[PDB]
Amino acid sequence: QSVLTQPPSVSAAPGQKVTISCSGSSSNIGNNPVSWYRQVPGTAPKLLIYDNNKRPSGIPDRFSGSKSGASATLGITGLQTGDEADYYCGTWHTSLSSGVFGGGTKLTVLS
Amino acid sequence: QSVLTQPPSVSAAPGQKVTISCSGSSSNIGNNPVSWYRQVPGTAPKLLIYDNNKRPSGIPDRFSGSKSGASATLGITGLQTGDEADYYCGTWHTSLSSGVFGGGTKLTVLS
Amino acid sequence: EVQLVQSGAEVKKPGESLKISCKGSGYSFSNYWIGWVRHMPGKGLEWMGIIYPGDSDTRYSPSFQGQVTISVDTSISTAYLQWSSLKASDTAMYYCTRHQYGYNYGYFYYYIDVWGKGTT
Amino acid sequence: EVQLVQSGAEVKKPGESLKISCKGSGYSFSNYWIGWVRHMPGKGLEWMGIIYPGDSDTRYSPSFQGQVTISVDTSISTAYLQWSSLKASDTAMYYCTRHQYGYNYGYFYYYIDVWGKGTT
Amino acid sequence: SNFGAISSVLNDILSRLDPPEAEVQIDRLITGRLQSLQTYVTQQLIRA
Amino acid sequence: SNFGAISSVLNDILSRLDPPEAEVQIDRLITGRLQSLQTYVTQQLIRA
Amino acid sequence: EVFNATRFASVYAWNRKRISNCVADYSVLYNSASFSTFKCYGVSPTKLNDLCFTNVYADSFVIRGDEVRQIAPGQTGKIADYNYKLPDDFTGCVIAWNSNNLDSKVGGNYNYLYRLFRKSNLKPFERDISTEIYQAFNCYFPLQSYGFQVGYQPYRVVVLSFELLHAPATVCGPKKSTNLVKNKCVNFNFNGLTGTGVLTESNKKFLPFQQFGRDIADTTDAVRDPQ
Amino acid sequence: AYTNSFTRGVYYPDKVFRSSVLHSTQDLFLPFFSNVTWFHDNPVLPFNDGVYFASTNIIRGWIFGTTLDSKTQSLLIVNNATNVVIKVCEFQFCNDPFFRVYSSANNCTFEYVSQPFLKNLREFVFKNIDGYFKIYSKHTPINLVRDLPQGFSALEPLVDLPIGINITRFQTLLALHGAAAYYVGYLQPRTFLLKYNENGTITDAVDCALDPLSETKCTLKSFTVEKGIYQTSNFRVQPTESIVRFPNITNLCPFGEVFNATRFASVYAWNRKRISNCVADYSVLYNSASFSTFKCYGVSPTKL
Ligand SMILES: *[C@@H]1O[C@H](CO)[C@@H](O)[C@H](O)[C@H]1NC(C)=O
Ligand SMILES: *[C@@H]1O[C@H](CO)[C@@H](O)[C@H](O)[C@H]1NC(C)=O
Ligand SMILES: *[C@@H]1O[C@H](CO)[C@@H](O)[C@H](O)[C@H]1NC(C)=O
Ligand SMILES: *[C@@H]1O[C@H](CO)[C@@H](O)[C@H](O)[C@H]1NC(C)=O
Ligand SMILES: *[C@@H]1O[C@H](CO)[C@@H](O)[C@H](O)[C@H]1NC(C)=O
Ligand SMILES: *[C@@H]1O[C@H](CO)[C@@H](O)[C@H](O)[C@H]1NC(C)=O
Ligand SMILES: *[C@@H]1O[C@H](CO)[C@@H](O)[C@H](O)[C@H]1NC(C)=O
C-alpha cells in the first residue's frame, strides 16, 4: 500500500523488549538514514528516532533503532502503558526525490 | 512461471540435431555461466553441461551448448532413444544472490 | 523556542479552493525548509511536498504534483498552499512543519516539530 | 568417490516439523558448499538454499527464506533442514547436493552429484 | 633559489608536505644546492 | 649508490622491469654515474 | 589456497600467509583474463617467472570497489591510512577481482568491516585489531561495517609483496636449470644473480651460511651454486 | 652486579662474503664497555630491541613475549639436550618454570625442531628484526669465572624465524632439581667498523660512537691513525625546548556557512567568499567520512 511496508500492530506487556520493523526499497532506505516518530491519538507526531539509532534530547534512552539493508527496526525497552501509540517510519526517497513515510504501527500495551 | 523460461517439450528422430533453448534475464544469465542437467524418470539429475558449452568426463562429445545474451541453447547430435529425458537449465542469479533453474523440457525421441 | 501555528478549524464543500496558513516563530525562518504532511483519521501520514523559504524552491512528491501549489511569504515568515477543487475524501488532518534537509557533510533528513491542525 | 546419502522414505501430516538428513563421504566435507534443491512430481527442480559447512554461512533463496532453516554438523559431515509446519503440497522429491561455488579466478557455479530422495 | 621546488626554504617544504611527496621536492633542492656547492669548490681549486 | 633508483646494480633494475618503466630508473643512474665520473675527470685535470 | 579460498578476512584484520620453498608458476595469474586490476610495482609482471625471492607474502581481504585505488604505495584515504598501508617501497603486485557473487548478500553482509576512527594511522604493515571506542563507553567505536547487495560491489583483493634480498633464495619460478660450465665466459644466472664472466673453482673459505662475496662496489666476486 | 662488556657481542650482519676489508656498517650491536646486569631466582626482563646473553651443561631454554600468557602471542625456545624446539603456541603464565614449565600447548601457531645447541662459555644474541627472529651464538674456552673474559669473538647466525611477535619481556627457563651465573646485555643502533680476515672471519671491530679516538678511526676507515689533527664531525647544541606564539584571536572560522549552505551557485558564475581573522579547525573536514574526493595540492591535509 505504502512505498514502505509496516506491521499493522503489536502488543506486549510492560517491561518487555519490543522490536517492530518496517520495510521499503533500497532506492531510499539503503542509502538514506531512517527516521521514526510517535503519535498519541489526539497529539501531533513528535520526533522520536533520527538519522539512525539516535534520539533527540528529552527522549529517554530506552528507545533504539537499527537499519539493515532496505528495512528498519525500532526497539523499546522498559515498556509502559503510556507508551501506547502509533509509530511511523520515514525518510527522503532518493529516486523520486520526494521523501515518504511508512504505513503506521499500532503499539498497544498489555493491561 | 519460472525466472528462467523454457520450452515444454520437443521431439525428433534418432540421428537428428536437436537444439532446445531456455531464456531468462540478464541480471543472471548475461553475466553468470549456464549449467544444464539431464533427469531420466526415476533417476536423480546428473551434471550434463557446465559453465558454458562444456561437459564433464564420461559424457560423450555429442552434447554442446551456447549462451547468448540472456538465454541459452543446448544441442545434441546423434540422438538415440535412451536419450529421452527431461532437460534443465540453471545458474546462480546475481541480483537475488540465490541461483535458480529453468522450467524443464521434455525431450521425447521419435520411435 | 520554535513554534508553528496553523489556522483554526476549517470545513468546506467540494468544488472550492483553499489556502491554509502556517506561521513560524522563534527561529531564523529564512534558513530552514518548510513543508506539508497529511495524516488521515485512522490513517497514516502522507508526505506532501516542501519549499525552501529563502528562495522559493519547491520539491513536490509525485502523489501530489499539480494537486497543491505551495508557496511562502518571507516578509512575515508564513507559508501556504493552494488548490483547485476540494474532494470529499480530502477530509484529513494536514500538517505544516520545519525539517532539517541540509547536507551537514553527510546528508541528513529530519522533522523538528509540527503542532498543527487542519481539516476540510 | 564422493557419495551423498539421504534418509529413507518419509511421510508426515500437515501441522508437523521435519529435519531431513544428508551424509557426505569420500571427500573433504568441510571445504565444499552443500545445499538443497526441490524437484516436484511432474514438476521442475526448485533452487532452495545452501550453506558453507566450514563456517555455517548460509545463502537462502527468497522463495524459501524463513521457510526452512538449513544447518550442518561438521563433526560427522552431515547436513539437515528444519521447518515450522508441513503443508500438504509439500509433497515433492527434495534433494541434497554438493556444488562448486568457488571463484577459481573467474567465477563459476557447478553441480557434482545428488543421488538423494525425500517426500512428505 | 627554487630550482623548481615549491619553495626555497627547506623548512616550509618540510613543514607543509607529507614525507612521500615532500622528498620529491627536497630532491630538487638537493640536486641544486649540490651542483651549486660543487661549482664553488671547483672554482676554488682552480683559484688556489 | 642508488642516486634514487630502486637498486644500484644495473642488471637487476634491468632484470625485473619493463623497458618503458625501466629507463626511468636507468636514467637516474646514468645522470649520477655521469656526474660522478665527470667530477673525477675534473679533479684529475687539476691534479695533473 | 590463496585464491580459491571461500573466506577473505575483513580489512580491519587482514589475513597474511607466507609462501616458501617451492616453485611458483606466475603465468597462471598474469595471463588469466579474470582479474580486474592487475598492477605490479617495482617488478614487471611478465618477468616474475625469472626471479628468485626470499619470502612472498599474500595478504588477502575484501573492500568496496571504489577503494581499490586506495591499495597502492603512497595513496591516502580511509582504507589506506586507518586499515592497511603499504610502504613507499614496493609491494610486488596487487590483484583484485569483483566479487559480489560470493561475498555480498541478499542483504547487507555486515561481516566485512573497517575502522574509521584510528587515532594514530598505522605504519606500513601493521595489524591493529583493537576496539577503544574513539571519543565523541558510548562514544563511537572504530569498526563500522560495510553493507553489500558498482562502486559498492565487494571486491576481493590479494596483494603479493615480494621480500627481495634478505637471505638465500627460496621461491623461484619455473626455469629448467642447465648444468654449469667453467672457464668460458657465459651469461650465467645463479639463483637470480644475472651476469657474465668465467667461473673458476674457489679456494676462498666460505661458511655454511654465506651465499656470496663482494670485494667492493657491489662487485659480486664469488658465489656458491645452489645445487 | 654490573660488569664490563669488553668486546663481546660482535656478529656477522649478513653472509655477503668479504675478505680483508675494513667494512663499515650500521646495525644493532652491543656497545663496547657497557655495564651488564650479572644475574645469578630469575625475574622477567625487558627485551629492548635485542639482548646479549652469556652463560658458563646446566641451563635450559628461554621464554620471550609481551605478557607470557595465553592472552597474547608468546615465544618459547626450549632446550632438550637432544633437539632444539621452538613454539609460538600461547602457553599460560608459569611464574616458576620446572617438564613442568610447559603450561598448555594452546593455539599452536608455529613450530620448529633442529639439532640442540648444547670452564666454557656460550654466548647468544637475540633480536627481532622486521618479522624475523635472528639468533647468534658461539662457544668458547674460558676460565675467568668472576668476570666476563676479555678478548674478541664473533657469533655466526644459527637461524632466523619468520614470526613477527611483539616481544617486550623475557626470562630464562630452568627445570629445577645459589644457582648458576649468566649475564645480560642490551643492543643499540651503533655504527661499527669491522676488520674481516684473509678468510673472511671478523677479527676486530671499532665502535664508531664510543670515543673521539674511535671516531677518527672510523672516518679514516682504518684501525690505526697517524699523528695529526683530523676533523671527525660537527657539533651543535641540541634545542632545549619548543615555543609557539600564535596571535590572540579566537573567532572560530565559519565553515558550516560554506558547507551547510543550501545554495551552490552555478559553475558559470561560481561563488567565492574570503575567510579571515579566526581560528580554523581543519580536522572537521579531513576526518569526516562523508567527502567523496579529497585531494590537497601543495599542502598535506594532516598538517593544515
Ligand atoms: C550549518 O548547518 C549545520 C548542520 O548541517 C548546523 O549545525 C550549523 O549550525 C549551521 N551553521 C550555519 C552558520 O548555518
Ligand atoms: C582451489 O580451487 C580450485 C577451483 O577453483 C581447485 O581446482 C583447486 O584444487 C583448489 N585448491 C585447493 C588447495 O583447495
Ligand atoms: C635433485 O634431486 C634429485 C632427487 O633426489 C636428484 O636425483 C638430483 O641429483 C638432485 N640434484 C643435485 C644437483 O643433487
Ligand atoms: C626431547 O627428545 C626426546 C627424544 O628425542 C623426545 O621424546 C622429546 O619429545 C623431546 N622433547 C621435545 C620438547 O621435543
Ligand atoms: C586462540 O585464539 C582464539 C581467537 O582469539 C581465541 O578465541 C582462543 O581463546 C585462543 N585460545 C586460547 C587457549 O585462549
Ligand atoms: C608491544 O607490547 C607492549 C607491551 O605490552 C605494548 O605496550 C605495545 O603497545 C605493543 N606494540 C605492538 C606494536 O605490538
Ligand atoms: C683461514 O683459516 C685457515 C685456518 O685458520 C688458515 O690456514 C688460513 O691462513 C686462513 N686464511 C687463508 C685462507 O689464508
Cα–Cα nearest to H32, from H52, H6, H14:
H6
- Cα H99 to the chain's mean position, in Å? 31
Q: Which of G171, G224, G207, G153 is nearest to G49 (CA)?
A: G171
- Is C120 a domain residue? no
Interface check for F45 against chain E (CB to CB < 8 A): the answer is no
A79 and A14 in contact (C-beta within 8 Å)? yes
- Hey, what amino acid is at D106? G
From atom 7 of ligand 5, which residue's Cα is the shortest distance away?
Answer: H107
Cell of D65: 527464506
Q: Does residue C104 line the site of ligand 1, with CB under 6 A?
A: yes
Distance, C-alpha B52 to centroid of its chain: 11
Under 8 Å CB-to-CB from H176, ≥6 apart: which residues?
A: H96, H98
Residue nearest to atom 13 of ligand 5 (CA): H106
Query: Which atom in ligand 7 lies closest to the alpha carbon of residue G203?
Result: 13
Could you give the CA distance from residue A80 to residue C66 in angstroms, rounded to a whole number?
A: 44
The strand ranges marked E within chain A are: 4-5, 9-12, 18-24, 35-39, 46-49, 63-68, 71-76, 85-91, 100-101, 105-109
> Quick one: cell of D26?
569420500
Pull the grid cell for residue H242: 619548543
The answer to whether H300 contacts E16, with C-beta atoms less than 8 Å apart, is yes
Q: How many residues are there in chain C? A: 120
Any idea which architecture H1-229 has in CATH? Sandwich (2.60)
Query: Which ligand gives the minimal distance to the CA of G5?
Result: 2
Return d(Cα A48, Cα F33) in angstroms, integer. Answer: 73
H67-90: burial string, b at 16+ Cβ within 10 Å, e else: ebebeebbbbbbbeeeebbbbbbb
- Number of domains forming the structure of chain C: 1
Question: From the CB of residue H51, how many other CB atoms can be counted at a distance below 10 Å?
Answer: 21
Return all residues near H82 (Cβ < 8 A) that are at least 6 apart. Answer: H116
CA distance G13 to G24: 26
User: DSSP assignment of chain H, as one string?
Assistant: --EEE-S--EE-S---B--S-EEEEEEEE--TTEEEEEE-----B--TT-EEEEE------EEEESSSSTTS-EEEEEE-SS-EEEE---PPP-SS---TT-----S---EEEES----EEEEEEEEEETTEEEEEEEEEE----SSPPPS--EE-EEE--B------EEEE---------EEEEE-EEEEEEEEE-TTS-EEEEEETTT-HHHHHHHHTTSS---SS--------PPPS-------S-------HHHHT-S----GGG-------SS----HHHHT-S--S----SSS-GGG-
CATH number at residue C60: 2.60.40.10
Kindly provide the residue ranges of all beta strands, DSSP E only, lying in B1-111, ordered along the sequence.
Answer: 4-5, 9-12, 18-24, 35-39, 46-49, 63-68, 71-76, 85-91, 100-101, 105-109
CA distances from C101 to A27, A70, C35, C107 (A): 18, 21, 11, 8
Q: Is residue C50 part of a domain?
A: yes
**How many H helices and E strands in chain B?**
0, 10
- Helix E19-47 / helix F19-47 crossing angle, nearest 10 deg: 20
Q: Do chain A and chain F touch with ≥3 beta carbon pairs under 8 Å?
A: no
How far apart (Å, rounded) are the C-alpha atoms in residues D101 and D78?
19
Q: How many residue pairs bridge chain F and chain G with CB atoms within 8 Å of each other?
A: 25
On whether the CB atoms of residues G155 and G93 are closer than 8 A, the answer is: no
Q: Cα–Cα distance between H84 and H106 in angstroms, integer?
A: 20
Domain that holds residue C31: 3-99
Residue with cell 591535509: H301
Task: State CA H108 to chain mean position distance.
Answer: 26
Nearest CA-CA partner of G153 in G62, G39, G35: G62
D33 Cβ neighbours under 8 A, 6+ residues apart: D50, D51, D52, D53, D98, D99, D100, D101, G6
Q: Which chain G residues contact residue F21 at CB under 8 A?
A: 44
Q: Could you tell me the three cell numbers for C71?
A: 508557496
* Phi and psi angles of residue G69, each rounded to the nearest 5 degrees, phi first: -70, -15
Beta strands in C7-116 (DSSP E): 21-25, 33-39, 45-52, 57-60, 71-73, 78-80, 93-99
Residue with grid cell 563421504, as numbered in its chain: D25
CA G42–ligand 1 middle distance (angstroms): 48
Cα–Cα dist C105/C115, whole Å: 29
Q: Considering only CA atoms, which residue is closest to atom 4 of ligand 7?
A: H199
Q: Apex CA G223: angle with CA G179 and CA G218, to 5°?
A: 130
Cβ contacts of residue B69 below 8 Å, gap of 6+?
Answer: B26, B29, B30
Residues with a CB atom less than 6 Å from ligand 2: D 102, 104; G 1, 4
How far does F39 lie from chain G, in Å, by closest CA? 18
Any atom of ligand 7 within 6 Å of the Cβ of G204? no
CB atoms within 10 A of CB C41: 8
> Nearest-CA distance from E24 to chain G in Å?
12
Which residues of chain B from 17 to 46 reach within 8 Å of chain G, CB to CB? Answer: 32
End-to-end CA distance of chain G: 29
Q: Kindly state the cell numbers that stand for B28.
A: 543472471
Q: Which residue has the least CA distance to atom 2 on ligand 1?
A: H260
* Numbers of helices and strands, H then E, in chain F: 2, 0
In angstroms, the CA C23 to CA C37 distance is 15
Which cell is F23 given? 629507463
Cβ atoms < 10 Å from Cβ of H139: 14
Q: Which amino acid is at H214?
A: S
Specify the amino acid at residue G49.
N
> Quick one: closest CA in G to B97, which residue?
G106
Residue D28 exposed, middle or buried by CB count within 10 Å (0-12, 13-18, 19+): exposed
Closest Cα in chain G, distance from residue D25 (Å): 21
The span from the CA of A22 to the CA of G24, in Å, is: 53
**Hey, how many other C-beta atoms are within 10 angstroms of the C-beta on B22?**
25
Give the contacts of C58 (CB within 8 A, at least 6 positions apart). Answer: C49, C50, C51, C52, C70
What does the block give as the cell for B98?
540465490
Angle at H113 between CA H108 and CA H114, to 5 degrees: 165
Q: What whole-number distance in Å separates Cα of residue C4 and Cα of residue B61? A: 79
Residue G88 Cα, gap to closest chain E Cα (Å)? 7
* Residue G199 burial (CB count, 10 A): 17
Q: What is the C-alpha separation between A48 and B30, in angstroms, rounded?
A: 45
Task: Give distance in angstroms: CA of G3 to centre of ligand 2.
Answer: 8
Chain F CB within 8 Å of residue E41 CB: no
Q: Give me F19's grid cell.
A: 623497458
User: Does any domain span residue D114?
Assistant: no
The dihedral region occupied by G224, where left means phi > 0, alpha psi between -120 and 50, and beta the remainder, is beta
Cα distances from B53 to residues B49, B62, B67, H195, in angstroms, run 6, 11, 8, 70
Which ligand gives the minimal distance to the CA of H89?
5
Rounded to whole angstroms, the Cα distance separating C74 from A16 reads: 48
Alpha-carbon gap, residue A22 to A72, rounded angstroms: 5
| CATH, residue A8 | 2.60.40.10
G6·D102 Cβ contact <8 A: yes
G106 vs B32, B92, B97: nearest CB: B97
Task: List the 69-88 stretch of D: residues with Cβ below 8 A of B.
Answer: none
The residue to mutate among H195, H199, H201, H202, having the most atoms of ligand 7 within 8 angstroms of its beta carbon, is H199
Nearest to G30 by CA among G12, G10, G50, G11: G50
Residue C9, domain member (yes or no): yes
- Using CA atoms, how far residue G50 sits from F5, G25, G30, G180, H147, in Å, is 21, 10, 14, 18, 54
Rounded Cα–Cα distance for residues G147 and D2 (Å)? 37
**Cell 545474451 belongs to residue:** B69
- For CA atoms H84, H88, H91, H95, the dihedral sign is positive
Q: Are G and A close enough to touch, i.e. 3+ CB pairs under 8 angstroms?
A: yes
Q: How far is C100 from chain H (nearest CA, A)?
A: 11
Of G75, G71, F28, the C-alpha closest to E21 is G75
How is residue C28 written as a grid cell?
531564523
SS3 G217: coil
Cell of B3: 525466472
- Exposed e or buried b for every residue in A28-60, given b needs 16+ CB within 10 A? bbbebbbbbbbbeeeebbbbbbbbebebeeeee
Ligand 1 neighbour H147 (Cβ under 6 A):
no
d(CA G23, CA G29): 14
Protein residue with its CA nearest to atom 4 in ligand 1: C104
Closest CA to G50 of G73, G69, G25: G25
H or E segment at F11?
Answer: helix F10-15
User: Strands H154-155 and H10-11, how do they pair?
Assistant: parallel
Say yes or no for a CB contact (<8 Å) between B47 and D115.
Answer: no
Q: Which of G19, G215, G8, G191 lies closest to G97, judged by CA?
A: G8
Strand order in the sheet with A4-5: A4-5, A18-24, A71-76, A63-68
Q: Alpha carbon of C15 to those of B80, C12, C88, G215, H135: distances in Å?
A: 77, 9, 9, 105, 96
* Alpha carbon distances (Å) from H278 to F15, H252, H259, H303: 56, 5, 17, 17
Domain residues for B59?
Answer: 4-109
Residue H78 near ligand 4, beta carbon < 6 Å? yes
Across the interface, whether the CB atoms of D109 and B32 are under 8 A apart is answered yes
Only one residue has cell 651460511, namely G209
CA angle at A72 for the pair D57 and A60, rounded to the nearest 5°: 120
Alpha-carbon gap, residue A16 to A79, rounded angstroms: 6
C-alpha distances (whole Å) from H157 to each of D16, G195, H164, H221 are: 71, 29, 18, 26
Using CA atoms, how far apart are residues H73 and H169, in angstroms rounded to an integer? 12
- Whether residue D69 lies inside any domain: the answer is yes
Provide the shortest C-alpha distance from residue E20 to chain G (in Å).
6
Grid cell listed for H3:
660488569
Q: Chain H contacts of C33, Cβ < 8 Å?
A: 262
**Any idea what DSSP says for residue D108?**
-
Ligand 1 atom with the smallest distance to the CA of C103 is 5
CA distance H64 to H168: 8
CA dihedral over A99, A102, A103, A105, signed as positive or negative: negative
Burial class of residue H246, CB neighbours in 10 A (0-12, 13-18, 19+): exposed
- With beta carbons under 8 A apart, name residues in chain D contacting G34: 104-107
What was the resolution (in A) of this experimentally determined structure? 3.4
Instruction: Give the residue among D4, D17, D5 at the shortest CA–CA distance from D120.
Output: D17
Q: Look at residues C85, C79, C82, C76 and name the one whose alpha carbon lies nearest to residue C97.
A: C79
Contact D103 G32 (CB under 8 A): no
Ligand 6 centroid distance, CA of G122 (Å): 14
Centre of ligand 4 to C-alpha F2, Å, is: 49
| C44, C47, C108 member nearest A103 (Cβ) | C44
d(CA G178, CA G180): 6
* Furthest C-alpha separation in chain F: 43
Distance CA A85, CA A63 (A): 14
Nearest residue of C to residue H260, measured between CA atoms: C104
C-alpha distances in Å from residue C117, one per residue of B84, C4, C36: 73, 11, 11
Whether residue B101 contacts residue D47, with contact meaning beta carbons closer than 8 Å, is answered with yes
Measured distance CA(H211)–CA(H195) in Å, rounded: 18
Distance CA B95, CA G105 (A): 9
Give the DSSP H/E element, type plus range, for residue E45.
Answer: helix E19-47
Neighbouring chains of G at 3+ CB pairs under 8 Å are A, B, D, E, F, H
The closest of H34, H39, H31 to H183, measured between CA atoms, is: H39
| Closest ligand by atom to H47 CA | 6
* Single-letter amino acid code for the residue at H122: R
What is the number of structural domains in chain A? 1
Helix (H) or strand (E) holding G157: strand G154-163
Of the candidates D116, B58, G4, D42, which has an alpha carbon nearest to the alpha carbon of residue B50?
Answer: B58
Q: Are E8 and E1 in contact (CB under 8 A)?
A: yes
Residues of G with CB under 8 A from a CB of E: 74, 76, 88
Nearest CA to ligand 2 atom 13: G1
D48 is a domain residue = yes
**Cα end-to-end span (Å), chain B:** 31
Q: Which three cell numbers stand for residue D110?
A: 557447478
Angle at B85 between CA B83 and CA B89, to 5 degrees: 110
Chains within contact range of chain H (3+ C-beta pairs < 8 Å): C, E, G
Write phi, then psi, for G41 (nearest 5 degrees). Answer: -105, 135
Considering only alpha carbons, which residue of chain E is nearest residue H302? E18
H75 forms beta bridges with: H64
Distance CA E35, CA G70 (A): 37
Q: Are D35 and D46 contacting, i.e. CB atoms less than 8 angstroms apart?
A: no
Cell of F31: 645522470
Is H touching B (3+ C-beta pairs, cut-off 8 A)? Answer: no
The Cα H67–Cα H93 span in angstroms is: 8
**Do the domain assignments include residue D116?**
no
> Distance between CA G214 and CA H118 in Å, rounded?
34
Q: Phi/psi zone of residue G2: left (φ > 0), alpha (ψ -120 to 50 degrees), beta?
A: alpha
Within 8 A by CB and 6+ apart from F31, the residues are F3
Q: Quote the CA–CA distance of A72 and A34 in Å, as a whole number.
A: 7
- Mutation site for G-interface testing, chosen from H11, H12, H14, H15 by largest number of G Cβ within 10 Å: H15
